[PDB]
Amino acid sequence: MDFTERLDRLVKYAKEIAKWYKESGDPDFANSVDNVLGHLENIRKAFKHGDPARAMDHVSNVVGSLDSIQTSFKQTGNPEIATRWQELTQEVRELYAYLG
Which terminal Cβ of the chain has fewer Cβ within 10 Å, N or C? Predict the structure, then answer.
């Protein structure tokens, strides 16, 4: 349950979701997930460079972004993306629990 592995899986989930909607013809929604992805990528780097403060900031800003998407993420569409996003949200809050 290492911080490093959890973060790696975040990058994977937000990749495959942005990738999915890109093929499905959703430019804005795929971009929004890729923006979360870019934050996750930046967390991975910030923490790696020995900066926990900015890492915690970027994580809490991701938890906020996820919640903002979840409220607009109505119904249960693709079983694939429903699980990948359920994973993504829970896991980011696991990193947040590993931080503070």
Answer: N
